[PDB]
Amino acid sequence: HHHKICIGTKSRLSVPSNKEHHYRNLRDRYTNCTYVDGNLELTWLPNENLDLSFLDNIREVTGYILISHVDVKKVVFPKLQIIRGRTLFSLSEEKYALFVTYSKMYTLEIPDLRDVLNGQVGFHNNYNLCHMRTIQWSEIVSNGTDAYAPERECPKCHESCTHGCWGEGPKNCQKFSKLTCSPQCAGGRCYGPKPRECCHLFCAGGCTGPTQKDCIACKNFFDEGVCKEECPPMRKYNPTTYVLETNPEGKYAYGATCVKECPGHLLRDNGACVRSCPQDKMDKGGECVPCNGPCPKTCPGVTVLHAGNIDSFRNCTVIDGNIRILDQTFSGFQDVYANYTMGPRYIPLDPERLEVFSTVKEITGYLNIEGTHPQFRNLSYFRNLETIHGRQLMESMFAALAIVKSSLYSLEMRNLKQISSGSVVIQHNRDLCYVSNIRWPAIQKEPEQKVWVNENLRADLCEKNGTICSDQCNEDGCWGAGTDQCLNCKNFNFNGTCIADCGYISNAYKFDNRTCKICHCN
Amino acid sequence: HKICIGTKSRLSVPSNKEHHYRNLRDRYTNCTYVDGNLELTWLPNENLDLSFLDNIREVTGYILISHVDVKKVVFPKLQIIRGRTLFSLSVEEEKYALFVTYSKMYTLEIPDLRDVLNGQVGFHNNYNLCHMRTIQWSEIVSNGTAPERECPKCHESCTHGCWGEGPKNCQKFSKLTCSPQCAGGRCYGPKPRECCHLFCAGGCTGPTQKDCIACKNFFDEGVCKEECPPMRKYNPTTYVLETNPEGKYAYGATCVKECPGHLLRDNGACVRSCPQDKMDKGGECVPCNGPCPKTCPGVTVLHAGNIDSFRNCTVIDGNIRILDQTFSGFQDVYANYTMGPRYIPLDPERLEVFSTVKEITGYLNIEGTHPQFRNLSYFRNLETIHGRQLMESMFAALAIVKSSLYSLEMRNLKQISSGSVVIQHNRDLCYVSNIRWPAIQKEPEQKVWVNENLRADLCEKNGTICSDQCNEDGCWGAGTDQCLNCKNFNFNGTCIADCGYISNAYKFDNRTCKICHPECRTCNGAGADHC
Amino acid sequence: FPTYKCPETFDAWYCLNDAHCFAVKIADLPVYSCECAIGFMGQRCEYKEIDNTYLPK
Amino acid sequence: FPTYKCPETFDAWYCLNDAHCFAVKIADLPVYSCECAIGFMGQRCEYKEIDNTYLPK
């Protein structure tokens, strides 16, 4: 539950090549969303006609809000009330929870923004933007600080408005919970001006009554409408019996939220919800469980694969992160640090070096392949890859598997039985063959997961060449030419390959109509 | 700050009521914090002193007051009743943290009482009691008259009700007297923002976690905490558990950096036993590789009905109590006070079940009496009594009281990890006064009580004394295999003077001889060809 | 303080080690409790009393 | 939205795939962005761009 959770974006102040694609992305990400886990960054919307109704249901942002180069006449956050600022946006010193630059909007309307829990508010170079100076940010900003002129003539605030307004009308008056209080409750927010009308110290922003059950938001943990110092533990210690009992009323901690189950992008581990799993712990069914014996070698993923980090994947059985294989992976590239300082140049590497991923069985993030090289033809380096968890996804189309503009001729990764919680995008691979005929729902876990297979090599041109599925695979498809490459087999399945009858291949007993097995028969 | 152990006999009493008074006076005198239920019953005679109530500040279980006829019952310093054990008349009915009944007292004065944390309050059929109707129990209890006597109004000073007659007896308020911004806690002033941290029980003298009277959950560094500082600390910003250098183990309302050692360690806490998922492995409760080895839960009393469960057990989780009723058999009672199934008398021969037992995590209690129950050789392979749970106000890890025992015979008992030895009034038992118990006990702070057993002189004349091969540490029995420590040489759990006697024995060490290899008679060393 | 005899089944079998069953009705409910013989305590008189007068060794 | 050029030392290496480097200072603080060539996106335009306009299969 949690109504509707979103993942924010990290890619900040970065300019997109296509503006239509970029709008389509933000619309897909934020529609029906109520709670954005991460940063909500609204960048490069130049068209005034664009519909920003995806912001309509957003109520809370855990990270920061960045609004840059938005030219739409009216930017409106109808339901947003809380910006937590757990992560903050700052340039290469000051750190912001709300930051608006180079935007040509006439009005920015957040009529129900009550509290900014961490970081500052900042406005810069917004020539048509107005009313922001009538706001009095000391009320909204948690610390209690005054935070950061237009060209146009600006309409006076509606008569109803006591002090300030976000825009035109009486529904755009700024509400006050902190400054209109009796001194009798220093360090809190009131629902009225009288001395008894103060609110619980746990409240954030506003509040309806005096109890912790009455807050708009919680300065600490939010458990299903109630604010509390701590989340009810999954295991609670018993002082009398000296035993750590299992708690029937237990809940998992997810950020500043208390939840019964945990979001698909996180694993539950010891009463909390973590993205990664401990060194002495095994991922199993979305829970960090103890591994039987030695723990399977889990090494971290990388933002871009290169010569500097390829060795670090030696003997890895699980990759916790993503793999991006780009033209740069084979070409080698000039790295950079956030300092803006020049980084190391990675010695070009050839595709044969990718045999490192041979031991890899699982990738917890997404697998992305956009690299081109004459020798980089199949993707058999991941022939032991079993599942791609979509715990993190690409920014566009929520892709868990994205093969775009690669120099591939076949996939060749059998054993890949499951892409859980993602979409598959395979487009514009001039010579990629089998992708067109694989029915990807068979691999995918939920029918709601989408697939996009476009612009590859014609299925007919693949036929003419003969690079099709073996006459032993069912209608599901295959990863490549081979007999061991079928997704599923319409006849008998033996070892990794598929035969017509267990009569062929000498000794093999048929303990199933769909499978045969090897002997030392009946 | 003295601790005392509460009883749980309910309305039951010793036949001798003067003895019963002296029993109570012994138990609760100079006591500050009673662990368990305080049961103040059957004081039928006025003028009993009742001074042992003077120092009581906290009661973890319930308080039961029944059949006490002393005119004025005062708890001068009682401030919280935790009610972690509750009193009931029938399983279906209310459970009480405080219950006074059939009592002839004029006034029950518990001024200074602030909090009843769990359970309800009850008064039934006490004829002279007064002012309880004037008290607001909604103030004291979290959730949950007709005296036929003209009773004085509360003092003019009291704005509400009272406990007794004085201005000192006015009921003071810290819960209902509050602002509403504090639902769930107690205020130290009537203003909003003048409320105390939800982490503490009873009253409080300021807003911070240090300004608390009693600690609701855990007390650490003089500051009240709901949860003891985690070993792995969660980060809400980047969703990951970080390892905590400041992490402390939970140890029953206190927060310690290292566990007592006799206890196990479950991830966050010092524990007695691991749950079915996990198992003992070193100091920790590590989860099992494949299957978890059959656990063996201790029993409240050992009888013919439950003895079979202990078959083929190595570690007894819990304790072993063999009582008179064990051997004589008895009728069981279901929790809903209807008669259960009757158990046949247990034959001491059946205790052989415990011969496989090596460890006892709780305490060992032997009180049972039987003509054939002469020794304790059923526990001959028992090597350690952990004492993670102790018995009575004596704090006993091993208690042998009025048993029919003649000798102990527990050869392998090397250690008592925590708690005391108490062995008394065993009219036939020998050896026990000559056993140097400190040797077996893990820490020298641990105590021993050895009294009223068969006199050492009378054991000597019988010749039921230690071998000549045992040192000054004493012995469990008469035999050569029963010495706590060998005086000289040790051969297969047997104490010998010289390895040359056993023929097949070679001198492995200055205090050890080992049996020769199956091959030959006499060896110069330890091996097959060595002959 | 009136006290009555326990039901036959309780009178005979409830209290152990040569104790005597007594019954009281409190809040219209029957409560069965007992007088223990010298040296016993507990609810069903099942535990042997320990002397606390002796000093430790 | 008037933008000036980034240092020629910086221009040569930073932006990738024929991307245009452009710099804007905000309150005297030089922030360097990177205008991408068609079909490329990223902070430095290092990743190829995916077409999200096709219908799902």
Ligand SMILES: *[C@@H]1O[C@H](CO)[C@@H](O[C@@H]2O[C@H](CO)[C@@H](O[C@@H]3O[C@H](CO[C@@H]4O[C@H](CO)[C@@H](O)[C@H](O)[C@@H]4O)[C@@H](O)[C@H](O[C@@H]4O[C@H](CO)[C@@H](O[C@@H]5O[C@H](CO)[C@@H](O)[C@H](O)[C@@H]5O)[C@H](O)[C@@H]4O)[C@@H]3O)[C@H](O)[C@H]2NC(C)=O)[C@H](O)[C@H]1NC(C)=O
């Ligand atoms: C056996 O297997 C082999 C090896 O895999 C197959 O050979 C491959 O065949 C494919 C398909 O024909 C071929 O890729 C096509 O290349 C053509 C022409 O080559 C390019 O010419 C370009 C301009 O003259 C130039 O830019 C390049 O440098 C090449 O020399 C190309 O037109 C196709 O590209 C298009 O992709 C576009 C992107 O969306 C699409 O755009 C359309 O273009 C139309 C024509 O211009 C236009 O009318 C439309 O309006 C639209 O804009 C369109 O869908 C095209 O697909 C292909 O990329 C590979 O080069 C070739 N591989 C090798 C190694 O030679 C072989 O086909 C197969 N079987 C048989 C029987 O041969």
Ligand SMILES: *[C@@H]1O[C@H](CO)[C@@H](O[C@@H]2O[C@H](CO)[C@@H](O[C@@H]3O[C@H](CO)[C@@H](O)[C@H](O[C@@H]4O[C@H](CO)[C@@H](O)[C@H](O)[C@@H]4O)[C@@H]3O)[C@H](O)[C@H]2NC(C)=O)[C@H](O)[C@H]1NC(C)=O
């Ligand atoms: C050889 O082994 C015999 C069996 O173990 C042993 O006989 C026992 O001796 C004890 C002590 O004399 C007997 O216990 C006493 O019984 C009488 C009879 O009513 C009591 O008066 C007496 O009262 C107590 O005295 C205790 C000792 O100081 C004291 O703790 C109490 O407070 C109380 O006043 C004792 O209880 C026991 O019945 C005998 N058992 C048997 C089976 O006969 C022999 O003494 C021993 N030595 C020799 C030389 O034979």
Ligand SMILES: *[C@@H]1O[C@H](CO)[C@@H](O[C@@H]2O[C@H](CO)[C@@H](O)[C@H](O)[C@H]2NC(C)=O)[C@H](O)[C@H]1NC(C)=O
């Ligand atoms: C300790 O007492 C036990 C019984 O509790 C004795 O063992 C039994 O002794 C009788 C001899 O009268 C035999 O009838 C049984 O067959 C014995 N059973 C076993 C299992 O040994 C034992 O003799 C006593 N041991 C010592 C050292 O005194």
Ligand SMILES: *[C@@H]1O[C@H](CO)[C@@H](O)[C@H](O)[C@H]1NC(C)=O
């Ligand atoms: C896979 O790729 C390698 C290296 O490019 C090549 O040698 C091999 O023939 C390919 N296998 C298949 C089945 O196409």
Ligand SMILES: *[C@@H]1O[C@H](CO)[C@@H](O)[C@H](O)[C@H]1NC(C)=O
């Ligand atoms: C506690 O009572 C004992 C007797 O039980 C007495 O000797 C002692 O003086 C008392 N302790 C204190 C500190 O008053």
Ligand SMILES: *[C@@H]1O[C@H](CO)[C@@H](O)[C@H](O)[C@H]1NC(C)=O
């Ligand atoms: C409670 O008593 C009834 C008889 O009245 C009996 O049948 C039942 O077994 C008892 N309850 C339990 C849980 O054993």
